[PDB]
Amino acid sequence: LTEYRMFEYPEETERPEWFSKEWGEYYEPFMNEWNQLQSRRLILMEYKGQRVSPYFVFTSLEKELEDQKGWLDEQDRQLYEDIIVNTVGVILRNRIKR
């Protein structure tokens, strides 16, 4: 995915000021726990000028691949190749004959 130029950055919440009003031993572990867990990760991806989350890019690629895969069915590929190859075959027949 490097073309999308991913990049992550942790989102954090300011320590509530009321943490200062010391409570004692029994509560210190919970304050430490909150300090540890409050940090969370985000991912952002540049996609057609917007900076969007992976969900949006996944949906966009789903839609595109669903549409794009429908453009050129294999049978039509074979038909076009055959129709051009037929005129080339006629040219070869005429040159061999000449």
């Binding site: 540049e46 000028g49 005129t87």
Partner: protein
């Protein structure tokens, strides 16, 4: 939606026509009229089909429809056209073209006359004042139109060929447009910030030279330059260019006072040079011919007889001796118009003397033929 049997029907009609023409007009006129009717009904059907299909392919509807999903609708309609119409054209056109190559007007005019018989049999109440010859000409022009449609002509590409080539061109166009849709969808990773940064950089440039330097660094040099010189004149790593011998050029002064040309230039018509050269060359030829003649004895030269010889004659004789052995007939030719035959005896110590050196070689005799 076209019928895949179009060309099959036309081919069957032409097949029956071939079958009857092989029987050589030994049947009734009604059969001939029915055969012609089937043939040209089907051919006009195909003609309408190709007109409509080529209009569809060329359609500006397609040209504006490229810019949307509607092109997909156009793609489906076009692939249906190819699958029903052109595939039959390809499968049946070869045999049709062959049959039409067989059947010219010559193989048909009696059949035309019997068609005319049946036409007279029809109680046409129309404005039928056109002579029987007019009916003949109508049928002939119709059949010539068919022959041109398939086989074409030595001066024009057939209708079949033009149709096929336009079809191939359109197929390439449509596939390339699908490629373009892929390109449009994929690449979008805009660089706008880079370009605006670059404009900011450029505006900071003081003068043109700085801006050009920056452009070279950013986009890359748009070209390269070099000095023109006819030869690697120098080889000395230790001498500064000033102290070395320079390369001298002839600057054309930029005044008509001397010369300046844009329209076609003139030449010298140097006939006097050519006259002098011709006369000198022919004089040399004549003098060499005489030097050869100087030693002629009763129409031949025998080396042993020669006392002292011009070095040039020695070289000419050696040339003749060498050339003679190459040709099995031992005949030789000379620029003097003299055929020369060379016979060699090789048991001899004979000296051919001149101002320089005494050449010992095997004796020879030289006959000269009558160039008359």
């Amino acid at each position: 939606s076209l019928e895949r049997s179009q060309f099959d029907r036309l081919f069957q009609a032409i097949t029956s026509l071939q079958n009857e023409l092989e029987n050589d007009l030994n049947k009734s006129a009604e059969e001939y009229m029915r055969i012609w009717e089937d043939v040209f009904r089907y051919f006009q059907t195909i003609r309408t089909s190709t007109a409509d299909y080529i209009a569809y392919i060329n359609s500006e509807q397609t040209d504006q429809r490229m810019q949307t999903e509607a092109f997909l609708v156009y793609k489906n309609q076009f692939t249906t056209y190819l699958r029903d119409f052109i595939v039959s054209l390809q499968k049946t056109s070869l045999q049709i073209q062959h049959s039409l190559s067989e059947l010219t007007l010559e193989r048909l005019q009696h059949f035309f006359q019997k068609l005319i018989e049946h036409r007279g049999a029809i109680p046409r109440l129309e404005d039928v004042s056109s002579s029987t010859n007019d009916w003949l000409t109508e049928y002939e022009e119709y059949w010539f139109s068919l022959r041109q449609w398939f086989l074409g002509s030595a001066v024009q590409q057939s209708e079949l060929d033009i149709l096929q080539w336009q079809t191939n061109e359109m197929i390439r166009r449509m596939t390339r447009y699908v490629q373009r849709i892929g390109e449009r969808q994929q690449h979008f990773r805009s660089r706008k910030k880079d370009y605006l940064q670059l404009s900011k950089w450029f505006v900071e440039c003081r003068d043109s030279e700085e801006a050009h330097k920056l452009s070279a660094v950013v986009f890359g040099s748009m070209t390269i330059q070099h000095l023109q010189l006819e030869e690697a004149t120098t080889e000395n790593l230790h001498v500064d260019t000033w102290d070395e011998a320079p390369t001298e050029l002839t600057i054309k002064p930029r005044t008509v006072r001397y010369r300046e040309k844009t329209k076609p230039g003139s030449f010298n018509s140097n006939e006097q040079k050519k006259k002098e050269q011709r006369e000198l060359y022919l004089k040399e030829r004549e003098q060499e011919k005489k030097l050869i003649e100087k030693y002629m004895t009763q129409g031949k030269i025998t080396l042993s007889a020669l006392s002292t010889v011009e070095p040039f004659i020695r070289k000419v004789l050696l040339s003749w001796i060498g050339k003679s052995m190459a040709a099995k007939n031992r005949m030789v030719k000379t620029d003097y118009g003299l055929h020369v035959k060379v016979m060699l005896d090789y048991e001899k110590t004979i000296t051919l003397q001149a101002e320089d050196g005494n050449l010992l070689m095997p004796d020879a005799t030289f006959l000269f033929e009558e160039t008359r």
